[PDB]
With several copies, the nearest count.
Chain A
């Protein structure tokens, strides 16, 4: 007999191992593999498709389609319209394609895209300042403070969608998915740059927002997702 030894870890069943198993039903011939359009090879390719953010998820809107847009108007003074804390566990991102893929993974490291679109008439125009306050920085609460971080300024005309690329600013190499105080991601605040001027006195505009991942986004340490529960028994 050839001398073999059974080290520790050799009569166990680890769910995430990679072993070969005896084929029950031998000689079995599976049906042929035909070309079905749309084949996917990587879930990050799902996490790179823009999906709307429920930016108006207040207690009266969840469950209604009106939780996907907020209403902007002509105000004399600048105001903070909207804040999106970069937390891939926050219900803003944790329900989109980006967030619902990233929540299966404990860590994520890359750059985000956020595409703002204004749905209003063809005569309404306006400028907005989309600022991203880097990690460690307080929520701006004044446009003079918000415009010091990574920001852009997008017009409104003949083209309605604009993209702020939240760059990868971090100390560590990976940012935890469940947002904590050590790896927090900062905030993305949307400010009236000059106004929103509609063609009438009380006109309104409805702003949407989608999120996706840049090609350099990565994830690691697959886990359970907190975005699914089972309390009952499926019968």
Chain B
């Protein structure tokens, strides 16, 4: 819980608990007992809804796909949906198992093949690569059930890189890849339908659990432009004769006059 408020009478002190220093890079400890006359207040609120586990552990949407010919593919990443990508880009390193739930409006009999990294996925339905011996697969009938399965932390390091300030190839190389793109791939999910019944919309809800965030950061203050790319200059009109005009798309509203708001 949060601490209670202590009483505070009139104080005439020579050590001001108000005059701090912003330059020292430390925040002030000034509680309202230092500025005014407080009363004892049994305060029992908790920030239990703010800890990383309950903050991120809510099973948001990570990606949508569309079964074209009873087949669709999705490479696991949080980079497509800005709302959850921002909550992740709060922190630098994150370590979490994830719990994938598939909300599909299809009807019939579907199959999900979690392709671990480094192998070839089925390039279409009724491919030979679907008969797999070791690639873990999930069968389900969308009516009567939502398929769900946990992927443990597949990291190749002690955490996930939300931001990576490095490359993967040495200096003189030519196809160097900035960012977190090479640092990790979580495989991919290949969906197919064995029947013909339902729609084609598949939503992948992923819930980070057993989270352990590592380095806080300034939350993203600009709308994204690409994935894995942390650009923010939006090039809105590529066709017209202004393509070289780059919007900014921030969220700082302006007020008409200071000292009047």
Contacts and interface: CB of A to CB of B under 8 A. Distances in A.
A138 to B, nearest CB: 8
Contacts of B182: 180-182
A94 B261 CA distance: 15
Nearest to A28: B152
Contacts of A12: 138-140, 145, 147-148
B58 A16 contact: yes
The A interface, classified by DSSP as helix, strand, loop or mixed, is: loop
Contacts of A67: 252
Interface in B201-239: 205, 207, 212-216, 218-221, 223-227, 234
Given A21-B148, A38-B216, A178-B118, A11 B82 contact: no
A46 B216 contact: yes
Contacts of A32: 158
A204 interface: no
Which of the four size classes fits the interface of chain B? 35 or more
Nearest to A87: B261
A43 B86 CA distance: 14
A50 B156 contact: no
Interface string A32-67: 111010111111111111100011111101110001
A91 interface: yes
A233 B152 CA distance: 29
Interface stretch (A120-128, A158-166, A193-201): A158-166
Contact of B43 (A54, A83, A216): A216
Contacts of A49: 27, 216
A150 B35 contact: yes
A122 to B, nearest CB: 14
B261 A10 contact: no
B227 A234 contact: yes
A97 B219 CA distance: 8
Given A41-B52, A42-B51, A63-B250, A107 B258 contact: no
5 contacts: A33-B212, A212-B28, A215-B31, A227-B251, A231-B128
Give 4 closest A-B pairs by Cβ, nearest first. A178-B118, A9-B148, A218-B45, A223-B116
